[PDB]
């Protein structure tokens, strides 16, 4: 009576007092447990399942079914007890002070006769009074459990069923694996509808029927490490507690989705009017620090506007791009600009140095090492950067220097949006923007022909068909051949590159202003169609940056306003 | 009460005594913690973050938010304890001593009900009090944390969140990862300007505003083994600790931190 | 901190039982510069084994008595601490942790302790593992708030393998590079130590012995460092003179070097 009270929670009395949350659905398994409990010799259902799928809710749903009368007449009016093994070990010091107290439990179950133990965390049972080859709480129960004179529901995480129950398979015999599967999206809506009363009352805020349809769909596709009948409750309560935090109304689709935006980082909430103007102004905001490259700025702006409107495929990344073209025209400048639009900084860009994968065996940097190898404690240099940041821009910088077997690790990345690491954890790339910059010059062909962007687009498109397999270019959304930077585009890149040099001078409490004669001279000495914007970058370094670096050290230009004037031109 | 005082330190009482340094910024991060702590079930946040970004400082910002009363009413008059897991393993030679000490903690928390049990280094919970035949402190807390009858803040390095909380996938469910990010440089200047009086008082030096602006920009540009809200304080300290050294007031300036950073990485700045 | 797991180096320096430290005056200032910090005031002494890392701290413990403190290191006792001696005797649970929480309780109550722990490669994994409770989990909350001043000592490889591979341990110990001393610095070490070696062996060590001990040790011995392989030569030669009995010269330290290395004559 009170022997079980001081070592276990009376879960049947918790259902009479209404302390248990209403278990709506998973009643095809409550009847499955009662089919196991009504057996003769081994009547001990272990509820195995992924962590969070409601394994301990089924027994809470069972203990409610005891007092509702839903229970059959073979388990009618049976007091269920969640036996705390930690409370049995506590209060022991000496030899026998665990094993006596567990025999006090089973003497009462023999006496009282309507007791169904619930060993929550049945993996705790092995090694509970001593080691596995000694008298512990497992070895005491094993004569009782195989006879059928002790009914004991277990619940174990599936990962912890293979590690502790299956490791000593004599205990695995005494229990029946009652597979508690993860709810579907349609099933966890009506789980949330029954749980709505307990969370509307605690948070003092209403919860819309749409918000639980939202918290089921948004928890399914945008969470890929938790399980549904728990990760949907997380969106309800954190939005339920967000509403009672600010009021110290109701919970909408937007209230759920802005919780998930603060939990993953993925902007899944309905865009406000101030922000969605920037989404339509994405090209013009990307053109603030990229110049030209208009077909590429459109192409990566279409991928994000498709993502924010919610028209992207839920089983694919947000965008898969290959930035091919001549070197220096802004293949990596744009991938930093796209990572500054989405975040604010360009070190939020996941730059994968893909040129240092030239070995045919550095693919283990992308998904970690397999079991049996150090580099198993590290999940990988790519999977663990997206397990943390699911909404990312993952730049694969200069892909054409790697081996062909690094591309093959990235096939399912592009089509399925998955990349399972070596330690067995799939990582969603479904919300990343996968950029593959390829650097694939002389202003003639080889031989006799009649001929920039003309006879270069069809050239590099056939050099991607030659270097890649046609299954990789199949999975890439858009391949954008990049323009060589024209003369009128180098003039505007002077304005971009000088404004960082002048930005370096704002810390020196001065400012640099250039004349139109001098910006033209830097552009005339910085133009090269085959190497573009780095010879402009070197010209400003050779004629502006170092000559002002000397004149700072002469004290010739201190914090006064230096204007760089042309020497002579025309 | 007395049971929690011998197994941990009250951070709320430490915030009344002014022993916790000011947390300038982190308003949206403590708001996320108090959002998670106000849940009905699984009201357990984890400040995951890069090592040194102020994970334990966010909770120090919470302990002085309770004293100031800037918390919501569901977290008003909470006593925030840093649970010393070494204090629980200490003196647990015999079977069931650790499990007694942990259930005595939880009996006091269910009694009072105003306890937020901050467990710093939550990766140490998996294997806490784990012996040949024992019950680890994870499996004792897992029924408490899942039902929301134990408010518990964790603080774990992202590296130490893979190896010990994602290798225990049951315990990862019981918590909520509150990503404490590496702050921007302009946020770090406000961190440093808020910590100006604590390092003025201990190093006995005046630290000018440009020195705070330098030591955030100089640390971010020239130090990569640490994170912003720490490698910037690191340059403020060895600035001012050298002035306690060589003088056995002198202002800390841009020159006083650049000569620290020059003697730090070997980079002449 | 009890005298059970270490000893008071400042009480030894007050009684003058520590070695006179000639040289390393710049390194002691860098230790005082790290110890004078409000937070993270934990100088790890990175140097090759036997370059004088304890001799930095033995000179630092003298500087507490000599009054070279920055007034935040004034009247601070400096208990050394063998971290492995707390490990020794632990086969059961809470043996290491009780003896580690006791010595941290005796710092909060006393209030002027500066621990010198050597072997910080032992710190990571002092208990069972990192997910278990080790000394690289108990010290860390107090090593970030400046409430615990621990002076470390690694090699450079132990610092790379155990601290630089440990997240959130790089930021709590601040590196102080105790370099390998030159040959003239090593002679000046031996000039300061000779009042101990001539009074212990009751011999007279000539000036020609030390200029040879700083040269022959670099010339013939490469598995071990100078400010120890040169101290050893004039140590054993004083013992060999006490055994054969008195004056040590470059002929008395000569046959001492010939004893070890495979030199027949």
């Amino acid at each position: 009576s009170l022997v079980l009270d001081q070592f276990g929670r009376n879960l049947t009395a918790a259902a009479m007092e209404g302390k248990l949350d209403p278990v709506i659905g998973r009643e095809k398994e409550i009847e499955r447990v009662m089919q196991v409990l009504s057996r003769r010799t081994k009547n001990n259902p272990v509820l195995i399942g992924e962590p969070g799928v409601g394994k301990t809710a089924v027994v809470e749903g069972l203990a409610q079914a005891i007092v509702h009368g839903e229970v059959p007449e073979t388990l009618k009016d049976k007091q269920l007890y969640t036996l705390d093994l930690g409370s049995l070990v506590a209060g022991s010091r000496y030899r026998g002070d665990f094993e006596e107290r567990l025999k006090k439990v089973l003497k009462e179950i023999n006496t009282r006769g309507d007791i169904i133990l619930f060993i929550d965390a049945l993996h705790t049972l092995v090694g509970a009074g001593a080691a596995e080859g000694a008298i512990d709480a497992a070895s005491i129960l094993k004569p009782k459990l195989a006879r059928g004179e002790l009914q004991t529901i277990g619940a174990t995480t599936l990962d912890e069923y293979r590690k502790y129950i299956e490791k000593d398979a004599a205990l695995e015999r005494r229990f029946q694996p009652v597979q508690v599967g993860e709810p579907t999206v349609e099933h966890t809506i009506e789980i949330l509808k029954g749980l709505r009363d307990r969370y509307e009352a605690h948070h003092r805020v209403s919860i819309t029927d749409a918000a639980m349809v939202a918290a089921a769909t948004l928890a399914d596709r945008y969470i890929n490490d938790r399980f549904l009948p728990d990760k949907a409750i997380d969106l309800i309560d954190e939005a339920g507690a967000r509403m009672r935090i600010r009021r110290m109304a109701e919970v909408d689709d937007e209230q759920i989705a802005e919780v998930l935006g603060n939990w993953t980082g993925i902007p899944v909430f309905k865009l406000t009017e101030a922000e969605t103007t920037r989404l339509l102004r994405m090209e013009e905001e990307l053109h603030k620090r990229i110049i030209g490259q208009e077909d590429a700025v459109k192409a990566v702006s279409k991928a994000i506007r498709r993502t924010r409107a919610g028209l992207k495929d839920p089983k694919r990344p947000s965008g898969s791009f290959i930035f091919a073209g001549p070197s220096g025209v802004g293949k990596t400048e744009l991938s930093k600009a796209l990572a500054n639009f989405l975040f604010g900084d360009d070190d939020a860009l996941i730059q994968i140095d893909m040129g240092e994968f030239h070995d045919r065996f550095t693919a283990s940097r992308l998904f970690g090492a397999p079991p049996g190898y150090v580099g198993y404690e590290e999940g990988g240099q790519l999977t663990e950067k997206v397990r943390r940041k699911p909404f990312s821009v993952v730049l694969f910088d200069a892909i054409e220097k790697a081996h062909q077997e690094i591309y093959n690790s990235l096939l399912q990345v592009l089509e399925d949006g998955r990349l399972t690491d070596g330690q067995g954890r799939t990582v969603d790339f479904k919300n990343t923007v996968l950029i593959f910059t390829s650097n694939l010059s002389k202003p003639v062909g080889l031989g006799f022909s009649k001929g920039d962007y003309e006879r270069m687009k069809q050239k590099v498109n056939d050099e991607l068909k030659k270097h890649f397999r046609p299954e990789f270019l199949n999975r890439i959304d858009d391949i954008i051949v990049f323009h060589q930077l024209t003369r009128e585009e180098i003039i505007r890149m002077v304005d971009l590159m000088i404004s960082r040099v002048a930005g370096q001078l704002k810390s020196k409490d001065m400012a640099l202003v250039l004349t139109d004669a001098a910006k033209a001279l830097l552009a005339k000495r910085g133009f090269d169609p085959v190497l573009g914007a780095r010879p402009l970058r070197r010209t400003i370094q050779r004629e502006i940056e170092d000559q002002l670096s000397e004149k700072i050290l002469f004290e010739e230009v201190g914090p006064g306003q230096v204007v760089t004037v042309d020497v002579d031109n025309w | 009460s007395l049971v929690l005082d011998q197994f941990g330190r009250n951070l709320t009482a430490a915030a009344m005594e002014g022993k916790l340094d000011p947390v300038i910024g982190r308003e949206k991060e403590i708001e996320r913690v108090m959002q998670v702590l106000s849940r009905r079930t699984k009201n357990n946040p984890v400040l995951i973050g890069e090592p040194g970004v102020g994970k334990t400082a966010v909770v120090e910002g919470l302990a002085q938010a309770i004293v100031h009363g800037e918390v919501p009413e569901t977290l008003k008059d909470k006593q925030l304890y840093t649970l010393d897991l070494g204090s629980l393993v200490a003196g647990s030679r015999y079977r069931g001593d650790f499990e007694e000490r942990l259930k005595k903690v939880l009996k006091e928390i269910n009694t009072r009900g105003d306890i937020i049990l901050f467990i710093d280094a939550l990766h140490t919970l998996v294997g806490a009090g784990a012996a040949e035949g024992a019950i680890d402190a994870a499996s004792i807390l897992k029924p408490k944390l899942a039902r929301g009858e134990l408010q518990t803040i964790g603080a774990t390095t992202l590296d130490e969140y893979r190896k010990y909380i994602e290798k225990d996938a049951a315990l990862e469910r019981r918590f909520q990862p509150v990503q404490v990010g590496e702050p921007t440089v302009e946020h770090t200047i406000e961190i440093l300007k808020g910590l100006r009086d604590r390092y003025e008082a201990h190093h006995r030096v005046s630290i000018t505003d440009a020195a705070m602006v330098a030591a955030a920009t100089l640390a971010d540009r020239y130090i990569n083994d640490r994170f912003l809200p720490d490698k910037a304080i690191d340059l403020i300290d060895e600035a001012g600790a050298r002035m306690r050294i060589r003088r056995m007031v002198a202002e800390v300036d841009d020159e006083q931190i650049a000569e620290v950073l020059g003697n730090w990485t070997g980079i002449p700045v | 901190v009890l005298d059970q797991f270490g000893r008071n180096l400042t009480a030894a320096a007050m009684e003058g039982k520590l070695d006179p430290v000639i040289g390393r005056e710049k390194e002691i200032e860098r230790v005082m510069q790290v110890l004078s910090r409000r937070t993270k005031n934990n100088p790890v002494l990175i140097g090759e084994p036997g370059v004088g890392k304890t001799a930095v701290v033995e000179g630092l413990a003298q500087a507490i008595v000599h009054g070279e403190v920055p007034e935040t290191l004034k009247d601070k006792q400096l208990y050394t601490l063998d971290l492995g001696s707390l490990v020794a005797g632990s086969r059961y649970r809470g043996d290491f942790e009780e003896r580690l929480k006791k010595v941290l309780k005796e710092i909060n109550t006393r209030g002027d302790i500066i621990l010198f722990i050597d072997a910080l490669h032992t710190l990571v994994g002092a208990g069972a593992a990192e997910g278990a409770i080790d000394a690289a989990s108990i010290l860390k909350p107090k090593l970030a708030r400046g409430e615990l001043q621990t002076i470390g000592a690694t090699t450079l490889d132990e610092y790379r393998k155990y601290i630089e591979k440990d997240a959130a341990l790089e930021r709590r110990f601040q590196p102080v590079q105790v370099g390998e001393p030159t040959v003239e610095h090593t002679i000046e070490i031996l000039k300061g130590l000779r009042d101990r070696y001539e009074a212990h062996h009751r011999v007279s060590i000539t000036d020609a012995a030390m200029v040879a001990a700083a040269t022959l040790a670099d010339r013939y011995i490469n598995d071990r460092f100078l400010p120890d392989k040169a101290i050893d030569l004039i140590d054993e030669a004083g013992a060999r003179m006490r055994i054969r009995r008195a004056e040590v010269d470059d002929e008395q330290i000569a046959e001492v070097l010939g004893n070890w290395t495979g030199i027949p004559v």
Binding site: - | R95, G133, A134 | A132
Partner: peptide
């Protein structure tokens, strides 16, 4: 070059708790 590192994980050297023999 393609020489594999062989992690070679040790068995857990762990602590032991105690049943104690009661005395007066």
């Amino acid at each position: 070059m393609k020489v594999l590192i062989l992690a070679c994980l040790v068995a857990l050297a762990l602590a032991r708790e105690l049943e104690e023999l009661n005395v007066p």
